[PDB]
Structure formats: C-alpha cells, structure tokens
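ok, trying the design again with the full structure, not the truncated one.
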C-alpha cells in the first residue's frame, strides 16, 4: 500500500520494508568533491542497437517502458560492471515543479526529473533471481533538466494519454532508447538499492554527469498522469521520487578526471 503521499510515502516505507534504513540505500547525494576518479574503471558500453521495446504500463507509481529481455539485445557492460546486464525496462521520477523531481542529487542540486534504465545481470538467469544478489542489477540514471525539447522522448510523451491511470498499458514497439542518452557517458558509480519498495540492495548505480534537456511542455505532460485507477478521484502522478539517503560506509567513484 506504499506510495508518495503524506500518509504512505518514503518516510513510512521502513515499516513494511525495514531495509529502508539499511546500509546500502538509494538514492544519495553525489558530493562531487568527495567522489574519486577511479582509473580501474573500464570504458562503459551501452549497446542498445538491437533493443526491442514492447509495451508501456502505468503501474500506479510511474510508467515503465518494457523490453524483450529473453535474448541479449540491449545490454550494458564495462565501467564498474563484470559481465553483461540486460535491459528490462525504463521509467522516470519527476516533480510537481521544475525545481524538484530527481532522486539522486549533485552537490544537493535537484533536477526536474531522472530516467532509470534498469538492467539485470545475465549470470543469474532472470530478474527475479538477480534481485537476490548484491550485484544483480545495474541502473543507468540520467538527469533531466527543462530547456529545449528532447526529440527522442516525444513518442513517450504522446502515448501517455492512453495510459492515464493505474493498470493501463499500451503497445509500445519500435522505441529506440538511444535517443534518451546525453552526448557524454561520463558517470559516477556506487553500490545501492532499488529506490521503490522492496528497496532491495542489489544495484550498481551508474549516474551520468551530463543531463538531457526536455521541454517544459514535455514534463507538463508527465504531470497529467494519475496514480489512481480509472473512475477514482484524480491524484496527479507527481513527486514520485525518494529523497537522498545516508551514504554510510560507501564510496562514490567517478569515471572522469
Ligand atoms: Co527508478
């Protein structure tokens, strides 16, 4: 029964999910002066040329663009990762106002939104087994700032009216996630968790330094979605972000000098 409201939001999650107060929780503030360049990081490889998107779903908390992960078709490798991680879905977190919405922050700066491309480690066979492992998942996080429109986002925006309410889905084939990436792949990395319940501590986070720009009109259309189901009182889908959590005994590494 978790969500993002006053009575069921992030400050309540620990009661059903005690790992919310764990040693490896996400998101975090990225203190750029404390993060250290790591020359042992290999080059990051984002191989999304054969990505096969299938469907888009409003799950009552965000919307997921789902991919066919039955074959190695869209994969993340390199950087801090060992082996191959397969893309299963992406989603966003965003605010009610342009001054908030991201989960990670950079020297306490909040962006308008944050894109998460979720991948699972193929050594574990499927996503469900991967989320029982400390290196099960790799999430590529990309900040969104408001400015010029992002052409590669428009197909997402324009289908949101068809998935307004919780539980609705639509066909969403032939979507190219390359068009959501910034120019540079410079990143920060650290060990963390899912940022929604069950908050499992299974993620290698790779957070790109360069944000993408999206237009005010694009993000306003995200804010017309609903957390509620059809025929229920409208609750706008906004502020579906968890705030930064304690870094504890962790180090954030940078890929760039
Ligand atoms: Co997320």
């Amino acid at each position: 029964n978790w969500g993002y409201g006053k009575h069921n939001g992030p400050e309540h999650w620990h009661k059903d999910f005690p790992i919310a107060k764990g040693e490896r929780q996400s998101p975090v503030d990225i203190d750029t002066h404390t993060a250290k360049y790591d020359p042992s990081l290999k080059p990051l490889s984002v191989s999304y040329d054969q990505a096969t998107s299938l469907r888009i779903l409003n799950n009552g908390h965000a919307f997921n663009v789902e991919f066919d992960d039955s074959q190695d078709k869209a994969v993340l490798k390199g950087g801090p990762l060992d082996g191959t991680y397969r893309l299963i879905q992406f989603h966003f977190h965003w605010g009610s106002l342009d001054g908030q919405g991201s989960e990670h922050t950079v020297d306490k700066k909040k962006y308008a939104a944050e894109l998460h491309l979720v991948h699972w480690n193929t050594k574990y066979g499927d996503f469900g087994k991967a989320v029982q492992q400390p290196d099960g998942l790799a999430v590529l996080g990309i900040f969104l700032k408001v400015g010029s429109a992002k052409p590669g986002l428009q197909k997402v925006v324009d289908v949101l009216d068809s998935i307004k309410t919780k539980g609705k889905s639509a066909d969403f084939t032939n979507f190219d996630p390359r068009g959501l990436l910034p120019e540079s792949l410079d990143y920060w990395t650290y060990p963390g968790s899912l940022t929604t319940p069950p908050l499992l501590e299974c993620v290698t986070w790779i957070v790109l330094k360069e944000p993408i720009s999206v237009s005010s009109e694009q993000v306003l259309k995200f804010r017309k979605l609903n957390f509620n189901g059809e025929g229920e009182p409208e609750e706008l889908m906004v502020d579906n972000w968890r705030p930064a959590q304690p870094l504890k005994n962790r180090q954030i590494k940078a890929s760039f000098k």
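Keeping the full-length input from now on. The helical segments are 13-16, 127-130, 154-159, 216-222.
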